[PDB]
Subunit: 315 residues, 3 copies
């Protein structure tokens, strides 16, 4: 049995060893919980974004950045892979814990979800849960959580607060852009499960996605970071048994395709948890089926929409 919280805790300790280099800052609160700021009152960095992504994926994914071009324009890209896709993506990475503690609101991702069982149905579906006495959570938020928030997280995870760590970054920050593009494989796995495909059948997944420039506020950044995956995110997946249903994985099969994610976000009143989950999906996928030995390709890339989404200005 692997422990995503223990593996991720090792990465968080590495992050804390290099705080100044990574442009992050931590604080131990009055109950002993550790809050790591990766973007609210600090700049963060590409490497902090990679480490935050690795932590969200329970330490069970490789994540790196390579610079490449789209129609000759240079971007940083995330390239990543995992051989524990259900656990890394659904059991850890997905932001499946909505944190609401009086006026404090955050989207919660990462290994702590596998202790608190958030949501319970996910852990039934992937047949995984952790048992650790350390909890590691990743918060997408424009404010840092206080003692009361950390005490609530600790309680839900059945751990002491002194054994809770939270990484925190806002949507519009470099760590935000990196970690959200770092969910490229997770988008595919999540969309596959939403359409009824058993994620326990998925053997491995590898993905690439450009890293959104940082737009002027958290709301517009929600749009462009998500469009990175929807219009320009590519996944190679290996599965035990193919299902014709997987033709409906790519975003271009959605009635909302062509729309800026910012549009969809606005209609949900800027509440991420009011977005229809059936809308998150990768631009393109290739699915290697171990049963037939065939590889089925679905989807397409769309630089035109992406450059609109990224507020690119050409000469």
């Amino acid at each position: 049995m692997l422990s995503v919280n223990e593996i991720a805790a090792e990465i968080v300790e590495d992050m804390l060893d290099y705080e100044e280099e990574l442009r992050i800052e931590s604080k131990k609160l009055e109950n002993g919980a550790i809050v790591v700021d990766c973007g609210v009152n600090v700049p963060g960095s590409y490497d902090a974004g990679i480490m935050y992504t690795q932590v969200c994926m329970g330490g069970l994914a490789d994540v790196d950045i390579v610079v490449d071009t789209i129609n000759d324009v240079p971007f940083a890209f995330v390239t990543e892979y995992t051989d524990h896709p259900a656990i890394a993506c659904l059991g850890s990475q997905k932001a499946g814990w909505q944190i609401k503690v009086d006026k404090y609101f955050a989207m919660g991702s990462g290994p702590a979800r596998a202790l608190a069982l958030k949501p319970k149905k996910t852990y039934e579906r992937i047949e995984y849960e952790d048992d650790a006495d350390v909890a590691v959570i990743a918060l997408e938020a424009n404010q840092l959580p206080d003692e009361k928030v950390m005490e609530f997280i600790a309680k839900e995870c059945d751990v002491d607060p002194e054994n809770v760590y939270a990484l925190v970054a806002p949507t519009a920050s470099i760590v935000g852009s990196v970690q959200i593009s770092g969910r490229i494989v997770q988008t595919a796995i999540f969309k596959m499960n939403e359409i009824g495909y058993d994620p326990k059948l998925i053997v491995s997944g590898a993905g690439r996605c450009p890293i959104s420039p940082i737009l002027e506020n958290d709301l517009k950044a929600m749009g462009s970071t998500n469009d990175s995956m929807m219009y320009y995110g590519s996944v190679f997946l290996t599965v035990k048994k193919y299902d014709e249903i997987l033709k409906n994985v790519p975003s271009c099969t959605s009635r909302d395709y062509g729309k800026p994610f910012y549009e969809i976000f606005k209609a949900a009143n800027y509440d991420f948890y009011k977005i229809d989950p059936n809308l998150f999906a990768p631009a393109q996928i290739a699915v290697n089926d171990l049963e037939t030995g065939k590889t089925y390709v679905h989807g397409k890339l769309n630089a035109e929409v992406l450059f609109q989404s990224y507020q690119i200005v050409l000469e």
Copy 2:
């Protein structure tokens, strides 16, 4: 003073510390030999694949995976380089030792070849021999080696079985796919030797090759993994003195070029013998000549053949 077996054993010790994360399993046999299953009864992983390949190359190469596209279809690629191409590729990685013990048969690669000296003529040519009390072999096989097999290998290496490690994966497995595409530099070096170009003249090489999808059995996989290099493997090589014979390195200069290996092999009725050996070669190379300061490009890529080989189904 570089020991490919000592360096490789350190990598194998790492693989042992992370078995469950890598999805591999090890057994210590009655004679003490350690057999590490990287794909027979276990799924393996992309990282087990990279480490397997690093082991094959004696620890003297960098090997990593990046996700990229071919005609927009996503694949995982190996990207690799070495500054010891003779030792890493000829003295270690090449599957140059046919292991035949009763009815057990496997192609052996990796550092143990440099203790067994298999074949002797290679070690004379590259002016390398290892001197070590530990042997690390990598076996491409559908069955794990038992006590008697490991005793045989240890005898041939002159090491006590207690100090022999074998990594094992079948041709159709993720480790199989990764480690075979991870021979992209080795196929250039080996083809260069084959056509009469002294490997001692070769300074370094750096290569890129897509990782084949896993096909439905070892024989089809033998085809697709090899076609990765023959139809879509690229190598940049640096040499002390270029000779025009090197125009013959690319696989496209073989009389047998043009169909997927498995179909060529079908056409030879499973007969190694009746296929031009010059077919085993990279798709394209660029050769930086240190003498003239020119860089000579030969060969081409072939996505059309690659996609037949990979049994790609487009919509």
Copy 3:
């Protein structure tokens, strides 16, 4: 505070633990200075080139090599990024220390610059100074510095020669080619400062640049290594506030744009420090402005000129 010398010294100690693997050679001089030959009487290596580049950037950058193609011709590329672009690129990397000790000439780069403050105006512009009592310099030179040269460097940095390290490689060497393409982010940051843009406004930068083949002498190599960046170097940059003057960052906005830099190296008398500093610029940039949330793209790639600089011979 981040000490570029203390961090870089750790990289050099790592290089000293793997000399034979990296194909480098070190000597401790009489005064205790450690001279690491990375390319003068030894071959060096791609990995030695990456570590030399990392040391030039003060350990404050990520540097890796990926193999990819330009018009299908395979090359090794540097992919790199930093979140301390003023410190790493201008405070450390730029070769801003002209070394002239009797008959010994070298271009000096690297963290020792931030101890000797060379040139002073740079340290005033970026507001950085180091306080280490170790010094690490990178010399681009075709001969190894002796006891007297290292005495001069140690004195200028206010450190005992026993605590000084020098890395040394000529322009025509693998370490030369890697390290110079490894300045792709720095070329953008330097040009930005040149045209009056405060480098303190620069949040981060990420770049890709092909690694030049080694040409037949240091003079031709000065041309092709530099053309890598000027004709095929791409940079993604983040800044706090955009300024329209940044439209003049790309090399193609210079009067002299269009011919290989080999013609330009002569029209400065083969003196690097005689070259007009406004020609020294990246091929293409994307500038993400945090204020407006827009990303402005300028410049263009030029494979045709690159293949000429590189002395590519196609069939």
